[model samples]
Each structure stands twice: as structure tokens, then as C-alpha cells.
Target: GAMGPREVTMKKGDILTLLNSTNKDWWKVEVNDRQGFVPAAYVKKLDSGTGKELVLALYDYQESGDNAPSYSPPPPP
Candidate 1:
């Protein structure tokens, strides 16, 4: 890659694969057939537990797309 970590284009509410985080500033997410870096704040992570269904008030951004990821977990530093 040219600059090592290139940025990817995404809509305000696009669901992408949570790949890996290079740092606290950006997130390495996989979308379409390529991967790119997205702002860590751009994503809205769902519950990691089998909490059944939505129990909370669910905000407008809680909307999810059919292009959900294959599932990946992040480990803390």
C-alpha cells in the first residue's frame, strides 16, 4: 500500500467487517472485496453477548445492513 494504511470510503451507516485496530484513532475494517481504515467512532458495535434481541430503546443508527461481517472480536491492549 502507498501510505501503509489507506482510508476507505463508507456511508454514514454502512456495516463493515471489524477487522483489526491499528490504534485507538482508527479501525481496520474490511468491506466489499478490499480493506481500509475507518474512524473508530464511525462504527456502532452490537452486543458481543447472546443477549437475545434488542432490549434497549435502540437508536436510529442501530439499523444494520445485510452485509454484516463474518464475526470478529477485538482484544484489549
Candidate 2:
């Protein structure tokens, strides 16, 4: 049987909460109250520290306080 997966798009600037990251290639996330899996490379972590400072740092990194920075993966050889 052929498997068809549902397509769940992750829009730019969407605030997603990282849940389970057991898989190195993909991490479970929640966006707009909807849960799904997104490529680990798609997300960026500005700091390892926790609390308000970390949150603010991430926000500062995001351009216009809205747009998410492009995820630049290594070019395929």
C-alpha cells in the first residue's frame, strides 16, 4: 500500500513551541495550537540559556519582530 502523508505548512514568522526532539532529523512542534513535525534544521536556537532573556534574544534575532530568518542548510554536493 502506498502511504500518503498530510501536508502541514509552516508559515514564516509563525511562533512554534518545540516539544519532543528525540529524532535528530525532525522535531515535534506546536504552532497556532496545532501539533506537527518540522525539520530540525528549520529552527534556530540563539542561546542555550533559559528564561526571559533567552526569549527576548530569539525575538531580537527575528527580523521586523515578525519574519523568521531563513534556514540555510549546507548545499548538496
Candidate 3:
């Protein structure tokens, strides 16, 4: 997996939602609709993407968001 981290320029008053957390401190966030993760440490609070501001919800398991699995299909069993 050659997936690299994406940089998100969060506003000072913006609330960042967690896509996939590295640990308990850091989380990934998408910038606009670009699909990137940001550090939760710099965020103000943890959101579940309930409000209209949330693009991706907290429980959103993306195709290859963070650490799920490769996008390519597996070989024949």
C-alpha cells in the first residue's frame, strides 16, 4: 500500500470529523471533497458527521480510506 497522508488546512473555527484514527489522538480528514485525512490533535472536537458540515461520517469505511484493504480484487480462491 503506497497510500500517503494528505494535508488538510483546517480553519481555526472548523470542526473536523474522524475518518480513520491512527491512534486515539490523531484522525484522518478530507479537504473539501478531495478525500484526505487530518490529525485529530489539531481539531477542536470529534464529530460523527451528523450535521450538514460533515462530509464523511465517523463510521464511514471507505474503499481504501486508511487501513482496510487494497482496492484490487484478490486472486481466485
Best by lDDT: 1
- TM-scores of the candidates in the order shown: 0.46, 0.46, 0.38
Q: TM-score for candidate 1, please give it.
A: 0.46
Model 3 residue 47 lDDT? Answer: 51
Give the C-alpha lDDT of model 1: 0.44
Give the distance in Å from residue 29's predicted Cα in candidate 3 to where it truly belongs.
1.1
How many backbone clashes does every candidate have? 0, 0, 6
| Residue-level lDDT for 74 in candidate 1 | 28
Full-model lDDT for every candidate: 0.44, 0.39, 0.42
| Segments in model 2 whose C-alpha atoms lie over 4 Å from true places | 1-8, 52-77
Candidate 2 to truth, TM: 0.46
Sorted on TM-score, best first, the list reads 1, 2, 3
TM-score of 3: 0.38
Per-residue lDDT of candidate 3, residues 1-77 (tens digit): 43445335455555445455554444555555534444344553445565543423323222224333223322211
Write one digit per residue (lDDT tens) for candidate 2, span 1-77: 21223323345444456656555655445544444545555554344555321111111111111222245422211
